Design a protein around this ligand. Structure first.
Ligand SMILES: CC(C)C(=O)Nc1ncnc2c1ncn2[C@@H]1O[C@H](CO)[C@@H](O)[C@H]1O
Length: 371
């Protein structure tokens, strides 16, 4: 079985779906690895780096899509790639099918077998392929929040950690999942006074142990949310409700009572955002004004650090890539329930009940295609 990796084609998507380490492991097990020339340059992975690991480098995207039985990507296929979808191909990437009926229809019409990184789910409820991206997005959230607090960036002009005798920035992280924990940790590492809110007290209990009380924890009632947001210099919205679209926790009305020049970073913006006035924005123009405060809602944040996030993503996908490459989609999903929960399409059948509800489309029970 051939494994193919094309260059990512979306705007500012610098990541790549495999590293030389993954190539060497695939090549070692007797698989051809086809990589489009330049696919890894955005992540500081040179064409020579891939070749030396055993990859057969290919000049165009067309040949990768055409010759690969298992096609690894980072983002969903865009319109220019629908014509490349094939019936005898397994596509393994971030899909976000509920957000695109056109992508969903393209996969279905193609008959291709697709598996979504973000719904791969282990028995304990975790999402091991989304998690490294949530980790990166959290840590980024603190450092872009820090930057935009500078007066030269429209912020209040407050240094994250203060200096001796001067007040640190007051940072509120909403949500203590993978992303919020990581945002809280870096914001606290920078010297800020960090308060993390959640409705799951056990998550608060972990934070209280891990930083010995230094990261403050508050139960996330509507009252407590309003109070802390009013006093904050930087608000990080980290409520990434799995599958569900993010609730609007910070209304534009509450934004108008915020400190002037306060900064809001929404790292749930790949799910519509957890602020009311959040709209997906880009890396060139990152911020916009909401009642004399600054909103940051850049989507696909981990792509801005592709050297980090390409490795974080593909370290996590590699064992599923090996199972797929060695056994094919059906046996691999039979053996591994976590991989099965990512099954999205196969031969015109939509296999995700959540997507199928959200779009109004025939839902095929995943058991029918596997057993
Ligand atoms: C007033 C209402 C609007 C409210 O308080 N809402 C919330 N406030 C803080 N945290 C919340 C939350 N709803 C979920 N979460 C947590 O965010 C993490 C996401 O991974 C999860 O751990 C989850 O428990």
């Amino acid at each position: 079985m051939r494994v193919g990796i094309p260059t990512e084609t979306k705007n500012n998507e610098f990541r790549v779906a495999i590293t030389p380490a993954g190539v060497a492991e695939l090549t070692r097990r007797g698989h051809e690895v086809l990589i489009q020339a330049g696919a890894g340059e955005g992540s500081a992975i040179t064409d020579a780096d891939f070749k030396a690991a055993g990859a057969q480098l290919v000049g165009t995207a067309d040949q990768v899509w055409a010759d690969a039985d298992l096609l690894l990507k980072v983002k969903e296929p865009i319109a220019a790639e629908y014509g490349r979808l094939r019936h005898g191909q397994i596509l393994f990437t971030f899909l976000h099918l509920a957000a695109s009926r056109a992508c969903t229809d393209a996969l279905l019409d193609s008959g291709t077998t697709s598996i979504a990184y973000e719904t791969v789910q282990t028995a304990d409820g975790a999402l091991p392929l989304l998690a490294p991206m949530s980790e990166v997005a959290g840590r980024l959230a603190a450092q872009v929040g820090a930057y935009h607090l500078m007066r030269t960036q429209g912020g209040r002009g407050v240094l994250m950690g203060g200096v001796p005798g001067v007040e640190p920035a007051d940072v509120v992280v909403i949500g203590a999942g993978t992303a919020g924990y990581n945002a809280a940790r870096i914001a606290n590492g920078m010297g800020a006074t960090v308060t993390v809110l959640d409705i799951n007290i056990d998550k608060l209990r972990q934070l209280d142990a891990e930083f010995c009380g230094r990261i403050h924890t508050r139960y996330s009632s509507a009252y407590e949310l309003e109070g802390a947001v009013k006093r904050a210099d930087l608000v990080i919205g980290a409520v990434l409700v799995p599958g569900a679209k993010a609730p609007k926790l910070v209304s534009n009305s509450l934004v108008a009572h915020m400190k002037p020049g306060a900064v809001l970073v929404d790292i749930a913006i790949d799910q519509g955002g957890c602020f009311e006035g959040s709209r997906p924005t880009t890396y060139d123009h990152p911020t916009f004004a909401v009642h004399d405060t600054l909103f940051y809602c850049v989507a696909n944040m981990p792509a801005s650090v592709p050297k980090t996030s390409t490795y974080a993503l593909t370290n996590a996908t590699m064992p599923y890539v090996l199972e797929l490459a060695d056994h094919g989609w059906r046996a691999a999903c039979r053996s591994n329930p976590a991989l099965a929960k990512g099954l999205s399409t196969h031969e015109g059948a939509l296999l995700s009940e959540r997507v199928a509800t959200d779009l109004g489309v025939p839902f095929t029970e995943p058991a029918s295609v596997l057993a």
